[PDB]
Amino acid sequence: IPKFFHFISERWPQISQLIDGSQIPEFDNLYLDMNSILHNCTHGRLSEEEVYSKIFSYIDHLFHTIKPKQTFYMAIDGVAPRAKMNQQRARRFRTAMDAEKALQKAFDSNAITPGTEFMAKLTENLKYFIHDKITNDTRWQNVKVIFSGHEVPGEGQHKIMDYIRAIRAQEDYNPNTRHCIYGLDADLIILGLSTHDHHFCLLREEVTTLETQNFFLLHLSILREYLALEFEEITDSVQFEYDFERVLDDFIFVLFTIGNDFLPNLPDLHLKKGAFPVLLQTFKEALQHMDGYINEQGKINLARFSIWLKYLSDFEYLNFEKKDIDVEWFNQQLENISLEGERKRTRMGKKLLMKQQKKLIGAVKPWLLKTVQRKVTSDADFEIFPLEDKELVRANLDFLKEFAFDLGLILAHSKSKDLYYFKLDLDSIXXXXXXXXXXXXXXXXXXXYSERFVEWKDQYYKDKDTDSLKEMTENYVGGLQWVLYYYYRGCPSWSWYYRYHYAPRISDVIKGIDQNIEFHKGQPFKPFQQLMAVLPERSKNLIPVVYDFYPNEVVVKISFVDQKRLVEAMAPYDAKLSPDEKKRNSFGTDLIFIFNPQVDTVYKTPLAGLFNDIEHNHCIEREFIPESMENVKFLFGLPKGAKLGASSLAGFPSLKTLPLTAELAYNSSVVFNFPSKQQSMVLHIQDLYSLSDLAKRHMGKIVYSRWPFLRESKLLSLITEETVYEGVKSGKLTKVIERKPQDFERKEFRELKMTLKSNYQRTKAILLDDISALAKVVPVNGLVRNSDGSYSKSFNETIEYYPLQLIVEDVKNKDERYIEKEPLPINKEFPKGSKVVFLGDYAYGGEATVDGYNSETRLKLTVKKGSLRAEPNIGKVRAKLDSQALRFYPTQXXXXXXXXXXXXXXXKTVADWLSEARKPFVVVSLESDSLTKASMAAVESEIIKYVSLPDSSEQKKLAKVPREAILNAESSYVLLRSQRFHLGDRVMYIQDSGKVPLHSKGTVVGYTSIGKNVSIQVLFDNEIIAGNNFGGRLQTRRGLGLDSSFLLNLSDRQLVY
Ligand SMILES: [Mn+2]
Structure with missing residues (x-):
């Protein structure tokens, strides 16, 4: 729907969280709507290896971002129901046209449709990747991988929804299942909301390389919380039992009524001009002049819906009798409507x-x-x-x-x-x-109504006084009902469709509610018939070359296919297909992929370039996935004993943790680029009431910061205008020192408080009391091993400040990943057969196998030295070349700066001359640099030849090894992060999962810190199916940005012996 994300975002300004390598929540299930990926990976012709290289890289990237624990669900579009074929066919026709029209004069994207030759291969390829992954990526080995490919009829979106609805319907469904759905379609937010599962996010990408792209978790837990605040304002006025979940369901019907993929939009809604507040307001008022809800679990109440319609009709009507429509006008319309509802309820x-x-x-x-x-x-x-x-x-x-x-x-x-x-x-x-x-x-x-009105409306229908209007109308109203059923209950009909290109006038929908609506389930087209019902005689060559309804000329007013006429016109040519086309012209099943160590088979690659067979280390099987329905009903709304608000699982946001007051207001909120011109849910926070025993209670202990998204942090001091409360580790107990502020602290404190309060108003619509104190904190950034084998909380070095009123003392559900753990015995901490990273001079970074224990403090291992040849040299060489080739000076700034200030002065000049010079942008954070493009390539050339010299491995039985020559890379992200890296430094990928095969060496070509989180840019020894050329800088896919937690640094050995 046109401004829906934008509008929702500004109005309820804390719904989405930038993914930035800080901890995100754990999820149970990830669902991929993949069709956007296939498209996006087959544009910018490039080769099959490169194409599938991208797709694998994408699926893989999203899988690692979430790290789902139970179920990972991949979906591609099967054959759609008829309700969509006209638009499928309009889209498809525009692609063939635009290809010929543009490019050709001044790859066939349409291949991405089911039954196509391309898509039979895609399933062959993807299957291979899944198998490779389940064999080699440990993270992929304790989840159910479920592929629902194009072989199976239905939209990905819809297929996913049917899964969620099937599993939640059981009688053993985990009531607090944490759900994540990836996809670009704003609609998923609404489907998400439709499930009534509180713990539910959407993985999305920005809307103003892969490792440097921004992704967001849109959090339905806080969106629901905001929605509750949006509608609570009634509770006391509605003539039935108020229920947020039911209100939400009606708000969803309203959202579908406003836009959905199947019916055409009602004319003149004026979204990109700020009707949205008004349309909502419409619903809000309507809800108070009705005997119960519009939406019975997807069943529509037409009588009820026409009470809402009447408002929409006045809306249409008043706006016709206006000139231009802008925000100014909708803001004053919003007021009038509210005022009327108030007057009306007073008379009532x-x-x-x-x-x-x-x-x-x-x-x-x-x-x-x-x-x-x-x-x-x-x-x-x-x-x-x-x-x-x-x-x-x-x-x-x-x-x-x-x-x-x-x-x-x-x-x-x-x-x-x-x-x-x-x-x-x-x-x-x-x-x-x-x-x-x-x-x-x-x-x-x-x-x-008016009369100029009726005419202007008549001059609409003529253009594109009867009872064939009762027919249009009733088709539309049927549609609404098909849409809702589709989303709440499943496809109600493979054959229903809206038979017109345009929607009726709003004020006419009425004529069509005088019907009784049922549907017939039907059955989906066979692939090839759908193939024909869509696709123009311009991309005819993807159809089995053997086969009006197909213009060359064509809001796309493309004709509707006569289905009866079509199945028949093809059945002559039916019996003439291969055995492969009779294969392609049928239906498949969902597939499920499991890990099984006692499987050892050879998996042949359907791909060239960098791919090979999955050998004696192949470990997956595929199977048909069932589902096990029975005499089971769907579950509508929250499950019994679902945790909400302050009892939500860790990680998920909640507003209910502090005490506050919420009010809609014109807050000029700045979520994106410019200040909104509409109301926001403004949050007025209440102070909690000593300040000395507060300090004494929490100093150096774990308090919760980041309110909205409560994570653990350690309290360091408590600034105030005139007093600082500090924490000093006395050994066992940390104690509180109170003292006056130094001038810069008293400066900082005033400058900080002013900066926080306005940022919270402007950016999040949080109206703060006015800053009493200021908790200074550091957040928990993991666990870390101590000498004694125990593991304890680690903390990010970077100081953050928060007003004290936003500090929460405790939380019911604590993040398991941060529960401190006691020491373990050798055999449990490094079980016999366990694979580990050998530190120590014989093979720093070598694959190690625990064979047994010599003592209860010493153990014996097998260490593979992966190479007997010296590490290569260039990185280091080049690093010193660049640094000697580009010298830096203190003010009392680089030789290239010197040359720019000598060019400008010698020309006396300006101004544009300067804007012209500014083109090659070297713009980046402070600790983060690079090797010269020259150096980069020299490193590439001198690697390509190194990695083809003769070279061998070597094992060695080792014994009497002390526990600290070995480490579990698995659970040492913090240690590893604690390592210096310099340009030139040799490095090794050390993690048992992710996008690089274990033990790969590479050279560091440049580092990039997004504040606290460092991202090392690695030029790898071998090419990497997941890499890139650092945007031309390279000639092969050797390139990858990666988090230091993945890397052992072999040049600056910082963990040896
Ligand atoms: Mn959609």
Whole structure:
């Protein structure tokens, strides 16, 4: 939907988290919607090796970003239902056209469709990659890999949704399953929301090389929390039982109604002009003038939906009777609508009051006139008129008492106030037949579109007064219903479709709700028939060359295929296919891939270039995947005992952890590039209330920072305007020192507080109290081994500051990856047969196998020395060349700067001359440099020849080895990160998983620190299926940026002996 991510992002400004090598949450399941990848990898013709090189690299990249623990689910598009074939066929036709039109004059992308010759190979290739991976990447070895390829009918998106819905439907489903779906389509956010699984993210890529691309976790846990805040404002006004999950479901129907992939958009919604606030507002008001929800688990209530429609119709109508439409106009429309809802609900309430008022006189009259029929003499000699709605009595006491006064009555009660009633005011008194007339007079007293419009609408339908409109209309309304069912329950029909290119006017949808809608499940086309129902006589050559409905000229007003006419026109030519085409023109199954050490088979490669066979180390089988449905219902909404808010698993965000107040406002929030011109959910944070015992309680202990995304950190000091509380390790117990601030600390503190409060307002719509203190913290960056074999919390060296009000003391669910652990015995910490990294001079970085133990402190191993030849030399050589070739000086700045300041002065010149000079950009963080492009290539050439000199390996039985000559690279990310790296330094990939085969050497060509996280740029010895040429700088795929935790540095050996 057109501004949907943009609009959602600005309005609810904390929903998404940049992935930047800091810890992200653990996930149970990752689902890949892959079709965007295949496209994106087959443009920028390049070769099959290079093409699949990319795709493997992409799938692999996303798999390592998440590290799913249970299920990894890959999906490609099978044959779609008819509801999509017109657009499938419009898209496809535009590609063939644009190819011929553009490029050709001034690879056939359409091959990526099911049944195609390309796609039969793709499945052969991908399968190979999966097998290679499950054989060699340890991380890929404890998950279910499930491939649902193009052989199987349905959209990836939809196939994924059917899996999630099938597993959540069970009676043993983990209630707090952490879900992640990768994909570019904003719609996934809505499908995600549709599942009602709180612990759910979307892997996405930016929207303003692979290792330097930005990816985000969009967090549905906090989005839901924001949504709850969006709609809570009612709770008290709706005429049914308020339920957020049901509200959310209706908000989803509204979102599908606004846009979805199948029906065409309703005309003039004006999204890219700020109707969005208004459309929502529409829903908000509608929800209050209805008898229950619009959406019964995907079933639509048309009666209900037309109450919402009426608002949408007024919307259409008012905006026709406007000139241009802009934000200014929608902002004032938003106000008017709110004001109307307020007025309307006030009248509604006056009406209710008046009704109660009438029943009341209506019940009093006969008992009053009988009471006043008896003249007084000389209290219990009368009937009392009890009143029963105490709560409503109590809200109406001035009235009741004035009523009582007027009719000559008292409003009485009881000491315990459990009974109210009227009674004659007897203590207040003859032709007093004037009391009976005064009573009677008192009782009497209380008993008191446009036409230019229709035409302008008619001139729309003509362009692209009847009852074939009832037919259009009803097709559209049917559609909405097909869409919702599709998403909440599964494809309801392989054959339903919207038979028109355009949507009706909003104010007309009404004509089409007077229907009873059912569907017939049907069955999907065979591949080749779909192949024909889509594809133009311009990419005819992907269809088995053997075969109107196919223009050369064509909002794409491409004709709709007559299906009946088509299955038949092909069945002549049906029996003439190969055995491979009868293979391609059928359906497959989902496949499942398992790891099994006792499997040892040879897997042939369907690829050239850098790929080979998977040898005596091949370890996967494929199988058909079932699913096991039964007499099982789907589960709609949250599962029983699902943890939400402050009880969410670690890693996932929550607003519920602090105490706060939320309000929609024009906060000019700056989520992207310019300040939003619409309201944000502004968060007003409440201070928690000593400041001395606070310091004493938490100093040097673990407190939670980053609010929104609470991670553990250690509290270092507690700045204040006039006082610093510091932490000093006294050995065992760290204690608190209080002192006045130094001038720069008092400077920093004032400059910091002002900077935080406005950044939180401008960037996140968090309105802070005003900064009391300031917790200074460092975050937990892993675990780390101590001498005694124990493992304990490690911390990032970089100081961060947070207002104290955003500091949380504790959290129910703690990040398991950071539970400190006690020492272990040799045989458990390095079990017999375990594979390990040998430190120590014989083979620094050698593959080691634990054979047994000599002692209970010494162990014996087999160490493979992977090479008997000296490490190559150039990196080092070149590093010193560059540094000698480009000397730096202190102000009292590089020789190339000297030449630029001597060029500018000698020309006296400007200005553009300077902008011209600025073209070759050397723009990067402070500790991070590079080898000269020259050097880079010299390193490449001198490697290419090194890696073809004769060379051999060598093993050695070793014994009496002390535990610290060996390490588990697996669980030493911190140690490894702690290593210097310099340009030229020889390096080895040391990790049992990732994108480089174990033990590969390379040279460091340049480092790049994104603050705290270092990324080493490695020119590898051998080519790497996952690498690149560092954007031309190289001539082969030897290049890769990588995190230091993957690398042993062999030049500057920092862990030897
Ligand atoms: Mn979509």
